[PDB]
Design an enzyme around this catalytic site. Structure first.
Site, mmCIF file in Angstrom:
data_model
loop_
_atom_site.group_PDB
_atom_site.id
_atom_site.type_symbol
_atom_site.label_atom_id
_atom_site.label_comp_id
_atom_site.label_asym_id
_atom_site.label_seq_id
_atom_site.Cartn_x
_atom_site.Cartn_y
_atom_site.Cartn_z
ATOM 1 N N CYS A 169 -0.338 -3.513 -3.131
ATOM 2 C CA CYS A 169 -0.020 -4.977 -3.003
ATOM 3 C C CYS A 169 1.547 -5.060 -2.811
ATOM 4 O O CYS A 169 2.140 -5.293 -3.640
ATOM 5 C CB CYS A 169 -0.438 -5.851 -3.826
ATOM 6 S SG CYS A 169 -0.143 -7.599 -3.707
ATOM 7 N N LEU A 170 2.215 -5.493 -1.500
ATOM 8 C CA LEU A 170 3.387 -5.304 -1.364
ATOM 9 C C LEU A 170 3.890 -5.966 -0.180
ATOM 10 O O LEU A 170 3.265 -6.095 0.977
ATOM 11 C CB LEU A 170 3.917 -3.640 -1.156
ATOM 12 C CG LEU A 170 5.485 -3.761 -0.923
ATOM 13 C CD1 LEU A 170 6.352 -4.146 -1.918
ATOM 14 C CD2 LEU A 170 5.637 -2.133 -0.522
#
Length: 157
Positions: free
Chosen positions: A90-91
């Site tokens: 998650c980025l």
């Protein structure tokens, strides 16, 4: 077409720069006849629980690169608020706007740098792993113990 040709030319230059002048603690390379299914490695950061970890990643370059982001996941298990047990990350820079921040002026080197940074500076407020994120926020010494244990189990030959 000239589109495929421009992408092929760009990947060759990125892979050359990664082979000759990679970022500190970051490597990414071709190991197959495909230029779009790549391997990367991030060294655990100093003063983080991932220190002495060596982390393997898969880097897939979609046909629309650089107008679609690289698809990057950890092959090496890692204990982290923003990385799940399947290795999904998650980025912001791995997702398109408006939600994400991928843009064609970024590149493989800079998104691996961003992943290195995420390892040092988690985003526990936008957690992919709720329980690890809660441990990070409210029981930081337990988080450090568990993250160091995972590193020793999974990221250290």
């Amino acid at each position: 077409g000239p589109g495929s040709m421009q992408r092929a030319s760009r990947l060759k230059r990125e892979l050359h720069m990664l082979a000759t002048e990679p970022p500190p603690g970051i490597t990414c390379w071709q190991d197959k006849d495909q230029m779009d299914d790549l391997r990367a490695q991030i060294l655990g950061g100093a003063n983080t629980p991932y220190e002495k970890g060596v982390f393997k990643l898969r880097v897939i370059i979609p046909e629309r690169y650089p107008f679609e982001p690289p698809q990057i996941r950890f092959l090496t298990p890692i204990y982290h608020p923003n990385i799940d047990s399947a290795g999904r990350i998650c980025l912001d820079v791995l997702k398109l706007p408006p939600k994400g921040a991928w843009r064609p002026s970024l590149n493989i080197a800079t998104v691996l740098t961003s992943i290195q940074l995420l390892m040092s500076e988690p985003n526990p407020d936008d957690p992919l792993m709720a329980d690890i994120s809660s441990e990070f926020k409210y029981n930081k010494p337990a988080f450090l113990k568990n993250a160091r244990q995972w590193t020793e189990k999974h990221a250290r030959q």
